[PDB]
A paper describes a structure:
To achieve colonization of the stomach, this Gram-negative bacterium adheres to Lewisb (Leb) antigens in the gastric mucosa using its outer membrane protein BabA. The blood group antigen–binding adhesin (BabA) is one of the best-characterized adhesion proteins of the bacterium. It contains two domains: an N-terminal extracellular host-binding domain (7–9) and a C-terminal outer membrane–spanning domain predicted to form a β-barrel structure similar to that of known porins. BabA is a predominantly α-helical molecule with a markedly kinked tertiary structure containing a single, shallow Leb binding site at its tip within a β-strand motif.
We first determined the crystal structure of the N-terminal extracellular domain of BabA, from strain J99 (19), to 2.0-Å resolution. BabA contains two predominantly α-helical regions—a handle and head region, and a third β-sheet motif located on top of the head region. We term this β-strand unit the crown. The handle region, containing both the N and C termini of the extracellular domain, forms an α+β unit. The N-terminal helix (α-N) forms a two-helix antiparallel coiled-coil bundle with a C-terminal helix (α-C1) of similar approximate length. The core of the head region is composed of a four-helix antiparallel coiled-coil bundle, similar to a tetratricopeptide repeat motif (α-1 to α-4), at a near perpendicular angle to the handle region creating the markedly kinked tertiary structure. The connecting features between these four helices are (i) a loop containing a short α-helix (followed by a disordered region of seven amino acids) between α-3 and α-4; (ii) a 20–amino acid loop between α-2 and α-3; and (iii) a ~200–amino acid segment (including a disordered region of 8 amino acids) between the α-1 and α-2 helices. This connecting segment, which extends out of the core of the head region, contains a small β-sheet (β-1), a pair of interacting α-helices (α-1a and α-1b), and the crown—a four-strand antiparallel β-sheet at the highest tip of the protein (β-2). BabA belongs to the Helicobacter outer membrane porins (Hop) family, from which the crystal structure of the functionally related sialic acid–binding adhesin (SabA), from H. pylori strain 26695, has been determined. Whereas both proteins share highly similar three-dimensional folds, the four-strand antiparallel β-sheet crown of BabA is altogether absent in SabA.
Numbering used by the authors: 27 to 282, 291 to 402, 410 to 527
């Protein structure tokens, strides 16, 4: 029906006009602009300062927890071994402590006679990288991640591994840097995400014939102590990225609710899962990058002239570019947070990926009130043990409860946009008036509805707003009825 598409289009334009009219009025009133600025500063505080209630916080935590939890699921089946520099070995057993091994709190790398590499055992050089990122993330998680505003917190992280078997060179002087492998230390300054961290490495050899040594073989124990490791969102996301990308780059052989595939290469059988976790990390990294835009454009100073001069939007609005940047960056943090959520939420997935997330990644086999984050037990293997299911919930609920601020963010965006482009938006209001005036002349027997909009010149405006635009409410209500009837 022609006449019905007419009335619909007219109703929609009248609504548009009315909203644009209001936006122009708001943008010329410092008391309204100040209330919206105050709201914008308070939402920024919430996003960057809060934890439980911040979708930004929840999204970062979720990206990190997914990467740790992915390793706790698949680590026990992933093959590793060999000697230094990625060389095959004859009899090298290298054990990494506080790792989610098969019925163990260590992972044993003991694949002899095959060269490490793609579709083979992970090299010890790569396992070391993976294990250091893992231990940093688990220590940080156990203690609790700080609010996004707190970018200078520090944590100390200690871990140990052992080497046994004839010819194992993975704990030798040359590899570790100690003066003496039997009883030795080395301290250095290590760079972690651009920060200087003090690293202490210690080496000792435990003889098969030493007291308390119930293994009956002799072995080297390496301890690594990192002091002052950054625990910012940015830094922890970089560790998560190293964890996942090391797994992907090494693409190791594995052999094993059950997995869809029980032998293969990790980057093949778990490619869908890796894909999601890389995207989650990357979106969280971009979310955290918005923080500096928000922090650069503070909303604390009231606007308008403080001496007597009426506010002129054409000339008194140089704050608006900062306000638009702030509001847009908050909008973007919200959108990205939701994208991190949607990548992993089992409600949105199907097939083997849904099963991987519900039956493995989002559960914890640890005995209990649940175990604390960052805990590795002899049962961890095959389950995420990283609060993944609860963090998915907490991210959903923080986004739904951020609706108040989400509206305030949009209001600030619209108003700062209008200010930045005031001449052009004021001109669009007039062009929307012209389009309406045209549509009204092309509806039949509508002689009485021609007043639906009107305007008046005001050459005296102290604000340069020389045309006042009006909506006749009776004509509008009549038009709204006709349109409902079709």
């Amino acid at each position: 029906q022609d006449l019905s598409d007419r009335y619909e289009s007219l109703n929609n334009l009248l609504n548009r006009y009315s909203t644009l009219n209001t936006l122009i009025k708001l943008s010329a009133d410092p008391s309204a602009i100040n209330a919206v600025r105050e709201n914008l500063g308070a939402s920024a505080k919430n996003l960057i300062g809060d934890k439980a209630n911040s979708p930004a916080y929840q999204a970062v935590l979720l990206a990190i927890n997914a990467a740790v939890g992915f390793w706790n699921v698949v680590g026990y089946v992933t093959q590793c071994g060999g000697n230094a520099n990625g060389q095959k070995s004859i009899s090298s057993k290298t054990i990494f402590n506080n790792e989610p091994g098969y019925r163990s709190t260590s992972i044993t790398c003991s694949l002899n006679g095959h060269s490490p590499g793609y579709y083979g055992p992970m090299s010890i050089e790569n396992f070391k990288k993976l294990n250091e990122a893992y231990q940093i993330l688990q220590t940080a998680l156990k203690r609790g991640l700080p609010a996004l505003k707190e970018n200078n917190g520090k944590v100390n992280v200690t871990y140990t591994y052992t080497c046994s078997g004839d010819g194992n060179n993975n704990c030798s002087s040359q590899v570790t840097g100690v003066n003496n492998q039997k009883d030795g230390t080395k301290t250095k300054i290590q760079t972690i995400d651009g920060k200087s961290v003090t690293t202490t490495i210690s080496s000792k050899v435990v003889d098969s014939r030493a007291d308390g040594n119930t293994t009956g073989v002799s072995y080297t124990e390496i301890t690594n102590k990192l002091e002052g490791v950054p625990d910012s969102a940015q830094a922890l996301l970089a560790q998560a990225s190293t964890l996942i990308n090391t797994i992907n780059n090494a693409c190791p052989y594995f052999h094993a609710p059950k997995f869809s595939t029980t032998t293969g290469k990790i980057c093949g059988a778990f490619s869908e899962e890796i894909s999601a976790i890389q995207k989650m990390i990357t979106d969280a990294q971009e979310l955290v990058n918005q923080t500096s835009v928000i922090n650069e454009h503070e909303q604390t100073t009231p606007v308008g002239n403080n001496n007597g001069k009426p506010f002129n939007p054409f000339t008194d609005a140089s704050f608006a570019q900062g306000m638009l940047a702030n509001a847009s960056a908050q909008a973007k943090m919200l959108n990205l947070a939701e994208q991190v959520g949607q990548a992993i939420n089992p409600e949105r997935l199907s097939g083997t990926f849904q099963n991987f997330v519900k039956g493995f990644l989002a559960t914890c086999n640890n005995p209990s009130q649940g175990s604390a984050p960052g805990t590795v037990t002899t049962q961890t293997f095959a389950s995420g043990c990283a609060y993944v299911g609860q963090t998915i919930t907490n991210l959903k609920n923080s986004i739904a409860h951020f609706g108040t601020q989400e509206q305030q963010i949009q209001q600030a965006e619209n108003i700062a946009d209008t200010l930045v482009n005031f001449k052009s938006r004021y001109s669009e209001l007039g062009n929307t008036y012209n389009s309406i005036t045209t549509a009204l002349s092309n509806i039949p027997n509508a002689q009485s509805l021609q007043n639906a909009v009107s305007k008046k010149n005001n050459p005296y405006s102290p604000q340069g707003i020389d045309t006042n635009y009006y909506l006749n409410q009776n004509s509008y209500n009549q038009i709204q009825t006709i349109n409902q009837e079709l």
